Amino acid sequence: GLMVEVVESPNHSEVGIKGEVVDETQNTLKIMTEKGLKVVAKRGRTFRVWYKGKIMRIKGD
């Protein structure tokens, strides 16, 4: 149930869309919205994730 809303990519809103997430607690975090898919670490771009357990928000810098 890795449903996430993600805003990433060097731009005010390059790839930000309703997207899916992979690797929530595995290692790194990769999310794809619409303009494309970007891969970053705990620190990078702004993403909000929703799982079948709880909801958390992670923002870089």
Curated annotation (Swiss-Prot):
Reaction(s) this enzyme catalyzes, per UniProt: Endonucleolytic cleavage of RNA, removing 5'-extranucleotides from tRNA precursor
Group of enzyme by EC: hydrolase
Residues forming coiled coils: none
GO cellular component terms given for this protein: cytoplasm; ribonuclease MRP complex; ribonuclease P complex
EC number, UniProt record: 3.1.26.5
Main localization, broad class: cytoplasm
One record GO biological process: tRNA 5'-leader removal
Subcellular location: Cytoplasm
Molecular functions (GO terms): ribonuclease P activity; ribonuclease P RNA binding
Family designation: Belongs to the eukaryotic/archaeal RNase P protein component 1 family.
Protein name: Ribonuclease P protein component 1
Organism listed in the record: Archaeoglobus fulgidus (strain ATCC 49558 / DSM 4304 / JCM 9628 / NBRC 100126 / VC-16)
Gene: rnp1
Residues of the full protein shown: 17 to 77 of 102
